[PDB]
Amino acid sequence: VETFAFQAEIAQLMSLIINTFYSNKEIFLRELISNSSDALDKIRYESLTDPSKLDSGKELHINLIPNKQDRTLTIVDTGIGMTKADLINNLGTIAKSGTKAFMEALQAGADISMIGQFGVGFYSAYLVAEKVTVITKHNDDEQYAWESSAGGSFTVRTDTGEPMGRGTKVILHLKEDQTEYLEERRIKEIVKKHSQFIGYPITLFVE
Numbered sequence: 600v601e602t603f604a605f606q607a608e609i610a611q612l613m614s615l616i617i618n619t620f621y622s623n624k625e626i627f628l629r630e631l632i633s634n635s636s637d638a639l640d641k642i643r644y645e646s647l648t649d650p651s652k653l654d655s656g657k658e659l660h661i662n663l664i665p666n667k668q669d670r671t672l673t674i675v676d677t678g679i680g681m682t683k684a685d686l687i688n689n690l691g692t693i694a695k696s697g698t699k700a701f702m703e704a705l706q707a708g709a710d711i712s713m714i715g716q717f718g719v720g721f722y723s724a725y726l727v728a729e730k731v732t733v734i735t736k737h738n739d740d741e742q743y744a745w746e747s748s749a750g751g752s753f754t755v756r757t758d759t760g761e762p763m764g765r766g767t768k769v770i771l772h773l774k775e776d777q778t779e780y781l782e783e784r785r786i787k788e789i790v791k792k793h794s795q796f797i798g799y800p801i802t803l804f805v806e
């Protein structure tokens with residue numbers, strides 16, 4: 600298990616998300632579904648010039664899986680996935696610029712729901728989760744588990760768990776007061792409200 604420091608700017612963003620009073624927490628789901636959709640668009644387009652990129656799985660979809668026993672909501676996609684370099688180097692580079700812009704927008708009167716416009720919507724997971732675990736597999740790289748409970752550090756390890764083919768699984772370990780996001784009716788309401796035109800099947804699993 601390797602432990603890494605977030606860039607100061609990203610730690611600052613995470614603290615803002617965790618600490619700011621903001622009741623409209625439900626937007627985390629739209630942000631993660633949007634990320635999944637982008638990842639699916641990316642593998643689909645790449646496969647037009649290299650069909651072998653789908654050898655790791657042809658089906659392009661999103662699953663939402665609540666588990667009341669574990670108190671987790673998992674968002675699974677069969678998108679492009681992330682390499683180790685993405686997790687430790689590349690995504691932090693884009694996150695730095697997006698965070699700066701988002702901060703400027705907030706000072707000028709924007710609100711937290713607009714986070715996705717700045718390309719850093721992933722961190723909205725921390726509106727509802729005390730810990731986020733991400734399992735990811737990109738073609739030609741290993742399966743990794745990324746994890747963070749904020750506090751300025753994240754971990755990465757090679758994942759020896761259930762092989763996933765290709766894609767990303769975001770596992771939200773929900774805060775004690777955010778268990779509404781495990782309820783079928785609530786998730787259905789939110790998907791209908793904010794994610795109705797996503798161009799991939801979204802299957803809401805039941806418990």
Ligand SMILES: COc1cccc(-c2cc(F)ccc2[C@H]2Cc3nc(N)nc(C)c3C(=O)N2)n1
Pocket residue numbers: 634635638676678679680681686690693694718719720721722733745767769
């Ligand atoms: C999903 O897990 C993680 C872990 C660390 C950082 C990010 C991240 C951060 C950003 F600022 C902007 C974008 C991302 C991710 C968001 C993402 N989600 C999904 N489902 N799939 C992919 C390929 C990505 C991706 O390419 N980038 N995402």
